[PDB]
Swiss-Prot record, chain B:
This is Toxin subunit YenA2. Disruption phenotype: Cells with a disrupted yenA1-yenA2-chi2-yenB-yenC1-yenC2 locus are no longer pathogenic in C.zealandica larvae. Part of an orally active toxin complex (TC) with strong insecticidal effects on larvae of the Coleoptera Costelytra zealandica, Acrossidius tasmania and Adoryphorus couloni and some Lepidoptera larvae. The TC has an endochitinase activity. It comes from the Bacteria. Semipurified toxin complex consists of at least YenA1-YenA2-YenB-YenC1-YenC2-Chi1-Chi2. The Yen-TC:K9 subcomplex is about 26 nm tall and 22 nm in diameter with 5-fold symmetry and 5 copies of YenA1, YenA2, Chi1 and Chi2; the chitinase subunits may be solvent accessible on the exterior the complex. The Yen-TC:K9 subcomplex has no insecticidal activity. The native complex with additional YenB, YenC1 and YenC2 subunits is 16 nm taller and is insecticidal; the toxicity-conferring subunits are present at about 1 copy each. It is found in: Secreted. The isolated toxin complex includes 3 peptides starting between residues 768 and 778 of this protein, which might be physiologically relevant.
Length: 49, 43
């Protein structure tokens, strides 16, 4: 019973670690997103000119 | 006699015309006083 109990805990742990990693990983794309959005703003400024 | 003969306009016309050209020369402008530079834009 002890062994099985512990096992389940490790499964829990790795689940959380995966989700955490995934979230922080996904957080980086916003960098590029911001870059390109701002770039479009500047482009529109030039068009206005 | 409340009025006086004013300075006649053509004179100031001349003065101003030359002063305008002079100003353009002050700032390296066209005779039209337009910028001579291309005024490039970026960000």
């Amino acid at each position: 019973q002890f062994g099985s109990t512990l096992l389940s805990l490790l499964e829990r742990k790795d689940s959380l670690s995966f989700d955490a990693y995934q979230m922080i990983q996904s957080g980086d794309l916003y960098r590029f997103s911001i870059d390109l959005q701002q770039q479009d703003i500047d482009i529109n400024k030039a068009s206005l000119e | 006699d409340i009025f006086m003969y004013p300075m006649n306009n053509e004179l100031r016309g001349l003065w101003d015309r030359i002063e305008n050209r002079i100003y353009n020369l002050r700032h390296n402008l066209t005779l039209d006083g337009k910028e001579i530079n291309m005024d490039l834009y970026d960000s």
